[PDB]
């Protein structure tokens, strides 16, 4: 199960996937694993939409 | 009919860049790009939608 997500330095997308990581193993005991998925902000609006 | 609609679309088109060009005596048409859309936001028009 993919999630995605857009943060604006690579600190937050780190935090962003830790908090993922915790949250897979508060729910271990299940067969669905979850990945992050993160991008970084970009300047343009058509790029970010794009990227 | 489509046809219809295209044909007043393109007329408003052209009846604005004539009214523009004969107006101000200058037509707003620059060049474009997908992006880098950096230092040519300055000429803004505001004329072109009146």
Redesign the interface.
């Known amino acids: 199960v993919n999630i995605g997500a857009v943060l604006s330095t690579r600190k937050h997308e780190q935090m962003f996937r830790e908090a993922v990581n915790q949250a897979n193993k508060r729910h271990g005991s299940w067969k669905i694993q979850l990945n992050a998925t993160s991008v970084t902000h970009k300047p ?1 609006a ?2 970010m939409a794009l990227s | 009919g489509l046809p219809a609609r295209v044909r007043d679309g393109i007329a408003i088109i052209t009846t604005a860049a004539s009214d523009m060009l004969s107006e101000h005596s200058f037509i707003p048409e620059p060049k474009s790009s ?4 950096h230092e040519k936001r300055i000429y803004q028009s505001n004329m072109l939608n009146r």
Not at chain 2, 34 to 37: A, D, H, I, L, P
């Open positions: 343009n058509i790029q | 997908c992006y880098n859309t």
